[PDB]
Each structure stands twice: as structure tokens, then as C-alpha cells.
Design a protein around this nucleic acid. Sequence first.
RNA 1: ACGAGACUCUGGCAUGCUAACUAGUUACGCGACCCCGGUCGGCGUAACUUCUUAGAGGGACAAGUGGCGUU
Lengths: 57, 41, 313, 62, 132, 184
Amino acid sequence: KALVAYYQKYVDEASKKEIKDILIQYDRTLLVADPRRCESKKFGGPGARARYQKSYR
Amino acid sequence: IMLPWDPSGKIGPKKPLPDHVSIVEPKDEILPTTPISEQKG
Amino acid sequence: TEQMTLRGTLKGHNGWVTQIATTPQFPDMILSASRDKTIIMWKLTRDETNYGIPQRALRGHSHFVSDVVISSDGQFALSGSWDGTLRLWDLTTGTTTRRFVGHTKDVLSVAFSSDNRQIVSGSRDKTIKLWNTLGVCKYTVQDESHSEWVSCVRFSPNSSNPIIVSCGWDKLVKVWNLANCKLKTNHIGHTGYLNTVTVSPDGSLCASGGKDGQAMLWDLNEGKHLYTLDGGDIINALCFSPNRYWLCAATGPSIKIWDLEGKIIVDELKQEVISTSSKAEPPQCTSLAWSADGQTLFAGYTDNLVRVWQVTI
Amino acid sequence: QPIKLARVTKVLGRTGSQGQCTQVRVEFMDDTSRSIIRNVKGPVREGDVLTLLESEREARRL
Amino acid sequence: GRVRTKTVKKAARVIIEKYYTRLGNDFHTNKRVCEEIAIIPSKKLRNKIAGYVTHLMKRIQRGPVRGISIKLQEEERERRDNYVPEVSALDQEIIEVDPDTKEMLKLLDFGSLSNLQVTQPTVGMNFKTPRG
Amino acid sequence: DIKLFGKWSTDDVQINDISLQDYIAVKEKYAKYLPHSAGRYAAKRFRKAQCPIVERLTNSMMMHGRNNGKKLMTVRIVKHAFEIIHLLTGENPLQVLVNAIINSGPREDSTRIVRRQAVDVSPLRRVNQAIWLLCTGAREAAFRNIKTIAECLADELINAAKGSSNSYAIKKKDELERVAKSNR
RNA sequence: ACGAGACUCUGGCAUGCUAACUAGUUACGCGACCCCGGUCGGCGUAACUUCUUAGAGGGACAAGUGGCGUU
């Protein structure tokens, strides 16, 4: 992202376009942050979704 | 008791209910066709 | 007598082009605002492959850039955006010199003076603010101002008349005095909200287009309704040719140029490789501006492309 | 009998006791104008090729 | 599950019905229309309403919508519904007439017209649908 | 430029089965340097299919509890496995993997539509089942053995690609198809 | 009409805004070590707020395109 930002400001946008293309084509995550964060635990379980073992009889 | 709404904020709160969408009435404006100026000074 | 053509398309926007501002100084360069955060300073190469290539992006606005205008010198560039602020870009280096803060709501329009001294800014807060190039709101119109948004503002190239124009969504064209900072005259007659106002290169008459599709002319010498031209669709942007005796209109999908002498169409300009054949709306033209020499017409549509229109005959 | 290939031209419905089998209109890419309805396990989209170990069954429709 | 609730639709209909001429097809302009001409306490609800407004504006461009009214109502149900042809489909040269319709015109004053072609009667008296 | 793990250049490899050609993502576009990536392949339905099969293998290796989220540790296993495959066979290890995924996927399987009638499989089902089977082969093979994971994973991929029926994956695949013929 | 939704908090975005010696970065000087440069959560002061904090705004609406559907 820093080189793409350097090539935006301090050379032409033709070089920055060319390089953004080659990076995004390979892997989107080179220039875009994954918004995924550790989901909050809830009571009645050891974590977010998983619940504590229900007992019958 | 559910309080009524007042912008004064004395008898109730100042924020309206999120459900309520108060749409203001369009003014009875007349559409012209005449060459009209209003020069002054 | 003839027909316009495409030379090429200019492709370096994600959001669709809201304003194109030309310059007399640099002919191998055009500056266009956009519905994204970018304002692209182009480089016109005139190749087989690409007519225009993007040289610089003026990023900095929070939201949509609605209006851009270049200085007469071609050293600075002023932009008005929906963030509610203005930028004055060092067009050489590509950074903000001055950032003008004062407007409450979205700044829809902005213009320089011919001397690049005065700045007039039309916003959705029913106000027009007068700025210096050092960021001081010298005067604000409040008492007798527009009843709705200020959709466009332009200056008189005639220095003899300290007079500016302002179309609004109140369906009125107001004419202001720069000196005393209160209006000379109102212009009532135009039905439907106004999108655009362009002032003639002379500084003698002005065309106001909007919702009606009725480009009404307005003489600056004596405020009188000269005559009306039927656009057909909604009018988005007008522009008088700098050298020629031609008024241009961005009427829905088409670019409709008239001759001023004979009240008759010269050319209607549309897409030739039509893809909106089945239950699809064509990408409507929203902003356009004639070149330095009045030879080329740059036009930004809603499909994120700047299309060019040069004279063939 | 040979092992033949068929292309999914249309995925009709979701059949099976627990709705565990897509019911699918398959076009034989050998005999390009012969088509049958046929039950398929796993996720099926339009235009993926099935390997049939026999091409003579035909599923009962929804 | 992006179904608009009654609060979104009612608001979006009334906003078109009263402020039709201020709207367009762009979401982002009539988002700011909905900001001005209505006092909506939420930003999310503002967008929902602006969004359905734009959807109904595209529907109005196609044709008239069951739950809204346009000012003329609307150059087709008003103006084009005053359609008149050159000559009426009634004004016929040769009007075909049944022999028994000729009889009830004979027991009227109008026993002899010029422009009535009395036809041969419908032989094979068979006009019902078979049972079961 | 040039690829995989250092040293297993992708294009070279033919996907023989035109049925699985779409859902065995190995070649041209999916040529990445590691079996590691951010992910998002399990957000939408078929996004799984556009994941490079070496990352699929790596993910499906970390199983039986104690290994869950030890991806770097199974990136390494697959690295050392591809070493062993190249030295023991002399082929491009990607080609050996692809051949195994093709030969290891059951082509039709029984289900409950009683005495459970037979149905066909999705090509994606075959890829998923193939990866599961030959990983479950490698995992079972190595348990309480002096043989390592990288050796067992290599030997499973060889004997599967070879078409041996001495592999765990090919024996269970033949066993599914045999039960499927038993009720068609 | 209540309930659902709206709402509130929270996660993700802002090289736009507001600012900071109880938060930094970058420059510069000083000092250490290696053969101009490299290292330094060694020391200090000159701009700035990207990183940091938390305020105001913005931002997403099935909005754009193609399909299916009383269209």
C-alpha cells in the first residue's frame, strides 16, 4: 500500500494504476484490509457461538 | 407513564420517536410563464 | 452541415464525473471532478489506443466532489465537494494550499474571478459565501437569498459589470452585485428546479437549464427573458462555446448543441455501441465544457467515462 | 457399459428425505441432444460436469 | 431479508406523492431531498426511505403505481383517455342482423331500413357445453 | 515470473478429468508461493472452489483436535511431503496431488431417498471427499508409527495418484462406489 | 395500536475535520557501535497527527448492472 501511495504522489498515476492492477490481480489483501475481528464471547458457552454441554435426565 | 414529545423539553423529552417520520407540507406555490425582472438600485 | 465524432474515451474514475473544468493555458490537459473522492488532472496524448491518460489524482475530500474550476494561470485549481468544504489545489505538486471551512451542508458549486481574487460558493444551506484566497468568509447572503439549494454559480467575464449569476432549486435565477453584495434583479418564469447556469463569453447574456428541459436565456445588460430552447429531456449542464456562436446542453443521455442565430439543433450526440436496448436507462450526461480553442467538447456521463467531441468539418 | 460425462443445464429442486440431494436436468455432452432428470449429492451449480457410472437411470421429479 | 417495513414505505410514498418534482433517479440527491422535506430522526431510516423512494421513481418511469397519484393522473388516464377516432366503430355501412332481430324492428316503427343485411338463420341448434 | 514453494512451478500440470477441471484450482491464476492465505473461501457457497488445492490440503490436514489452527505446522508438512513425492516418484508434486484428487473422489455414492438408493456426486463433493479421504489416510497411517506425517501424506498422494488400491483413500473410494452399485 | 423492524451500544472505513510533554511519528542535533551508509524503546528540541486516543461529521440504500418473479 505504501509503494502504491508513493507511486500515486511522486510519479504519474499510470505507474500506480499498473502496479495496483498486478497486486489486486494476485491477492486483494495486498491493498485492502480484512474487516474480520475476534467476535465477543457470550455467557452460557466457552466462546462466541459454542454453548456449554446441555444435560437431560 | 409514556411521556408526550415537546421541543421545549419541560413536560417530556426533546428527541422524537425513531418510528415517527414528520413530513413538512409543500407550500401552495404558483408556476409562472411571464418574462419577469425585479431590477433595483 | 456536419456531424461530431468520438476520438476516444478517458477512463480513470470509479464514481461518475460531476464537473469538467478546462483551461486556456495547457491544451494537453483536462481537470475533471468525480462522484468518488478523486479529481483527475488528465494528460491528453492523442494516441490510437488512449486519447487521455490520468496524470494526477487530487484526493482529500471526505465525500462527492460536485464542482471543480481551474485558475486562469493554470497553477491552482479550486474544488467544491459535499463534505461542506472547498479545496484550492497546488495543481503542480498535487496538494491542498488552502482549505475553506464555513458552509454547513454540501457545497454544490464554486467559481473563481477572472483575476483569481474572488471566490463564490453555492451550498445546500440556502446561502452563497464570498471567499478570498487566504480563507476569510468576507460576506454571506442570508436575508433575501434562495428559498432552496444553490445548484450552480458563474461569473461575468466582463469586468465592467461586478455581476454574478446563481440558479437554485427554488426555480429562480438570482443576479447579484459583487460590490454592494446584494441582488441586482430576480429572474422568475422557469418552472422546475434548476441544475445549471452558464454565462456567455461576452458577459452579456446567460442560459439557465434545469428540470423543465427549457434552456431560458437571460440578458445581463437589461434583465429580460430573451427566448426559450426545448432540450427534450431534463437539462443537467449548459456551456456556451468560447469562440463560436453555439450553446451546448447535457439533455439526459444526449449532448444537444444549438446555433444561437438560427434557433435549430446543430447536432445531438449519443452512444454508437448501444447496450441499453432492453429495460435499461442510458448513462445520462451530467457535466461538459468546451476546450481552450472551442474545437473539442469534453463531457462526463454517469458511466464514469469522459467522452470527447471534436469538430470534423 | 461405459463411464460417461453429462453437463448440468438446470438444477430443478432439492429432494431427499433430509433435502440432501439436488435434482438436476443433465445434458449428455457425448450425444449432444439427449437429456434426463437425475439426483446428485453435494453442492451442484448450473454448468458443472457429472461422471455417470451408468447413463440409463432417470430420477422421479418433485 | 431486505424487506422494507410499513414505516419505510408509507413515508417513501407520501414523500413522492407531495414532493414528486424535487426527486430524480439518483439515490444520493433524493437522499438529501428526504433530509430537507422531512424530519427523520435516524440516518439508517433516512437511507431506507431514500432507497425505496428511488425504487418507486423507477416504477413511475415505467408506468403508474397502485398506491400513489400523479398531478394530471397522468397525460394518459386524463389526456389520452380523451382519444377519438376518425369515424366510430358504430358507424357501419352493412350491419348484419338476425331474422328475429328484424322481427322486433318490424314490430317497432323501423320495419324497413336501408343499411341492414338480414342474414340466413343459424342451422343446427347446438349452443351448450356437454354435461360432465 | 515463476512459482510455487520455491521450486514446484505450477503450469506443467494437466488436470486429466475434464469433470473436476473447474474445481481443482491449481493452475495459472491460483499459482501462489505458499499454501497459506488470508482466506474468505468459506464466506459464500462455491468460493471454496476458487481456493488453491494445496491450501485446501493444508487446511484439511490440521484435524483430530490437538492440531486445530496449527496451519504453519501443516504448511511445513505439505512442503516436506512435496520434497518426498519429487524424490520418490520424480514427477511435479502438484501433478501427483491433482492425479490423486481425481482418482480418490467417489464418482457415485448411496444416500437415503428403506434400504438407501444410490445417487451421483457433485464434482465439488468429489474434490472435498478426495481431500478428506487421502488426508484421513495420512493421519491414520502415521498414528503410533515411526513413519512421519510428511512421509504418510506423500505415500498416500503417490499410491492414490498411482491408482494402487493399497492407499486408504482408493480402498474407501472403491468401497463407496461398490455400496452405490449394490443399490442402483 | 403494542410486539418485529426502527432504536441503543459495539465491529469494520476516513492520509477529510477537531485537537494532544499522562499518546506518537517524522526531521534535525548530540552520543554509542559496525565497515557515506546501517543499527539504537541511547539523550534532547522542530514541524505534523499516518500510526495512538476520542469527538463531530460522513459512509450502505438491495443503491448500480444482468437474470428470476402477478413483473
